[PDB]
């Protein structure tokens, strides 16, 4: 059950992401992904793949940050999912 290993990895990526996300996005006129608190909620619906479109990126890097949260998140939930199936 080295799943907690992903929980760790992801929660960081969520934070890592939300910090860069705002950094990459600001400066780009019209971006709304420009404050930590929210960017953080973005990073979650993104890593959980729920994507509501309430917020998202428009700058090449913000998008690079995105792609990384998504994956890591898909990866994370995968391992954490697989683990739950074994011990149950």
């Amino acid at each position, epitope marked *: 059950r080295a799943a907690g290993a992903a929980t760790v990895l992801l929660v960081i990526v969520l934070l890592a992401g939300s910090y860069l996300a705002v*950094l990459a996005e600001r400066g780009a*006129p*019209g*971006a709304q992904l*420009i*404050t930590y608190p929210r960017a953080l909620w973005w990073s979650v619906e993104t890593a959980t793949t729920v994507g509501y479109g309430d917020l998202y990126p428009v700058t090449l890097w913000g998008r690079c940050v995105a792609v990384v949260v998504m994956v890591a998140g898909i990866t994370s939930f995968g391992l954490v999912t697989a683990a739950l199936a074994t011990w149950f």
Partner: antibody
Amino acid sequence: QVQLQQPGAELVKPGASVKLSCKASGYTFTSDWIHWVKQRPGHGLEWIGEIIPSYGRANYNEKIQKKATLTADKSSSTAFMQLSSLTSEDSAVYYCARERGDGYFAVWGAGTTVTVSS
Amino acid sequence: DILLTQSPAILSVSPGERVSFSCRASQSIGTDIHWYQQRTNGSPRLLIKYASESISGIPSRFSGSGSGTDFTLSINSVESEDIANYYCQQSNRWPFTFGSGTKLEIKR
């Protein structure tokens, strides 16, 4: 205690440049952004630009001619705004302000009155 | 960029009367509006954040409301110390922008 300290005034001859300073104290976070706002006498507040000390990146108001260059010294917790090639149009009070990355200016400096004259 | 319209530019009220400052955004900005007070020769001071959130240290007299494109800053029972210029500021989209300001005038 005063969170943001700015010098009272700066006299600059037309065409010359000046470097304004903003010394910050109190809690400091990696998410802090230091903003600069210009206000001409009798007029409103105009956003100039912002900088994130923890990373060093700066953004500027695209709607106005770029007169400023922002930098920050982490060790001295001081932010700087270099204004170059000034004219009387640049005469105004320049405020620095701190934002905790959450959208509002929690605190403002007292402002530096810049006068461009010979 | 988001344009913030503050009209009227001057508001005249009698002592102890309730007053309301208006701020209209060119597009919907949710509740990402903040209000500042600036007295003669003073620096701006945060009064209300995110349209209606109180700031510690500010008199209960001050309150805000609205969402979307229309916002209001209200003062219950105005007094002399409230004489100043009031500005709104948005943080929904980059770059942050300021309204042009409304001056409060008291008719004594």
